[PDB]
Amino acid sequence: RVDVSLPGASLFSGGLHPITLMERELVEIFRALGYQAVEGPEVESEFFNFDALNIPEHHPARDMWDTFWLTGEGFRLEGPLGEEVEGRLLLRTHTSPMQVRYMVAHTPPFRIVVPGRVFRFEQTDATHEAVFHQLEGLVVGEGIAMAHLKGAIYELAQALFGPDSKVRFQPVYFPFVEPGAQFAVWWPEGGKWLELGGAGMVHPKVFQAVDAYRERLGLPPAYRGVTGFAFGLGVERLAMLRYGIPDIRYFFGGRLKFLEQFKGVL
Amino acid sequence: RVDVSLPGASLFSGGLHPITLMERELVEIFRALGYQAVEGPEVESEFFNFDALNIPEHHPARDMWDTFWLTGEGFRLEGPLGEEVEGRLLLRTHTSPMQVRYMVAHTPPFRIVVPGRVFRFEQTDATHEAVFHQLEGLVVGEGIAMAHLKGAIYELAQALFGPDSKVRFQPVYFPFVEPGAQFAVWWPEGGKWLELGGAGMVHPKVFQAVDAYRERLGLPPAYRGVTGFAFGLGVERLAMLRYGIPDIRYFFGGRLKFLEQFKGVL
Ligand SMILES: N[C@@H](Cc1ccc(Cl)cc1)C(=O)O
Ligand SMILES: N[C@@H](Cc1ccc(Cl)cc1)C(=O)O
Numbered sequence A, B: 001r002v003d004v005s006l007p008g009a010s011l012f013s014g015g016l017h018p019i020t021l022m023e024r025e026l027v028e029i030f031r032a033l034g035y036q037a038v039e040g041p042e043v044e045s046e047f048f049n050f051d052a053l054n055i056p057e058h059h060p061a062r063d064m065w066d067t068f069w070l071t072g073e074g075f076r077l078e079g080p081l082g083e084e085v086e087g088r089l090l091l092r093t094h095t096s097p098m099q100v101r102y103m104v105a106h107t108p109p110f111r112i113v114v115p116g117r118v119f120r121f122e123q124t125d126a127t128h129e130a131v132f133h134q135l136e137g138l139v140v141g142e143g144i145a146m147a148h149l150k151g152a153i154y155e156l157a158q159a160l161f162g163p164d165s166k167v168r169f170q171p172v173y174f175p176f177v178e179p180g181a182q183f184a185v186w187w188p189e190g191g192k193w194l195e196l197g198g199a200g201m202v203h204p205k206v207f208q209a210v211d212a213y214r215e216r217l218g219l220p221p222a223y224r225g226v227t228g229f230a231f232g233l234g235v236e237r238l239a240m241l242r243y244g245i246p247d248i249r250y251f252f253g254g255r256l257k258f259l260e261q262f263k264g265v266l
Helices: A020-031 A059-062 A097-105 A146-162 A206-214 A234-243 A258-261 B019-030 B062-063 B097-104 B147-163 B206-216 B235-242 B257-260
Strands: A041-046 A087-090 A112-119 A131-141 A169-170 A178-185 A194-201 A227-234 B043-045 B090-091 B110-119 B130-141 B167-170 B177-187 B194-204 B226-236
Touching: A020 A112, A020 A131, A020 A146, A020 A234, A020 A258, A087 A169, A087 B177, A097 A112, A097 A131, A097 A206, A131 A146, A131 A194, A146 A169, A146 A178, A146 A227, A169 B235, A194 A234, A258 B194, B019 B110, B019 B130, B019 B177, B019 B235, B019 B257, B062 B177, B097 B110, B097 B130, B097 B206, B130 B194, B147 B167, B147 B194, B147 B226, B177 B226, B194 B235, B226 B235
Parallel strands: none
Antiparallel strands: A041 A087, A112 A131, A131 A227, A169 A178, A178 A194, A194 A227, B043 B090, B110 B130, B130 B226, B167 B177, B177 B194, B194 B226
16 A cells, blocks of 8 residues: 555756757757758857958948957967967857858858857847857858748748748848848737848858968868858747747846746757 | 765666667658658558558569458547548558558648558568568659659768768569669678668559549549659668667567667767
8 A cells, every 4th residue: 555646756857948949949940951050169260250251340330249359368269170260359249150160161062050159248138138049041052042041931930930920031231141131930929020030142252251261271162153041040039939938038047947947848 | 075986876877779769860861851750550451551552452562561460340440631441450561551641631742751660470580570660751742753762862871871872773663653663772881782672753553542532531632743752661670780780689679788788879
């Protein structure tokens, strides 16, 4: 005889962070489309974070990213081909620099998605962080057109919001793409357009930067006769909409009563 | 003071079965190519396992599968659209019947991969089982050609054996495909051609079977103007080659000293 309705050994039950779940789902969505996930370093060179992406200093466009500038020596920032690069250190303001690193280290055609923690000097409120996550996308190859960028996002939406979802593209500006664009997806439930991220056809100058850096490293040009599209989307804003989180500050808050709430989710 | 090199609480450490790992890897390989995994029932109707696939009785081709015939009443075998079908019960001799079930329940274009336990009345030796696993593939859609079947397998190989791998196709016979084929992949390490599975362009009569069954269920024809390819490969033979298992009988042997050996693997 035993009271079988009696509690059992208190073995701990784990869980994954909301961002991990969201990032995972996103990565799966694109894996099904032939994209592979790779990461980049959080501490970057001004060259990779800005210059290589067609974003020079004193440029009005560089104001789109409030940079955290770093200092200190003894630190070894390593480049794409493992080599020891230089440049003013800073915390990457977006995952974009990674599409330059990847391109100098591989050859087209290819599909990549790169998730990552990004940093920006900004005031932390209920829907704004200085430390958040993005998910970049980059598909390069001969004959790649903007019709493909639009199809990718269409697929992203369907996968994220169902058959009654739909995408919308509006021209927007980014120094690393041309044509450039911002896209929104239709959220049937909340019944409204969510501005998800920006995108566009990789910029001529970005390809040139890649090949120039390649030469300097002894590699042969690989992006002379190919085109490609890239995109980037904020993760928290989407995780919040999706998991119904009211305050973006929770993610990095570390509160268990909060985190524990996502054990179930997948 | 504590002897920190002293054993800790003996919390149990789990593990996954070799077939699960192999099946998983296979499913991932194809997910990246846009395939989605679905399953079918182990107990089947002669109609789905044979007739629907262009394999009639007393046919010399039906001898390619030694069937386990079942008996007993009260059992409810459910069809594709959840309805209660009939026919002589048997243990499926391959996963193929599932490509008929899926097709009457959905519309093209699409990509599916269906893993599954199959049964065949055969003598169990070191490299032969009566109970094993297959992985079917079926890609239907307007304009689908044999050039695509060949590309899929090419991708399968690369993903399974590296850049120095290569595929080979030879004409072979199957009542449910035409052209029909058998394919082998080059295994650089062991340096030899491994005959992996059969494939081919879905047979006209299979599409007709699907649409006929659809009508009988009130659904409209969906496979009149589309073509498609399918393939099927034995899982154990591949898991063995891959994990270096000497005896196929181990998988269903249930021996822990055996299973425990795969905890690490992924
Ligand atoms: N990473 C950019 C978003 C982006 C725009 C365009 C492209 Cl093509 C890719 C990403 C940002 O931080 O605003
Ligand atoms: N399922 C078949 C193998 C197969 C052959 C051809 C195709 Cl198209 C698909 C699968 C068998 O059990 O032998």
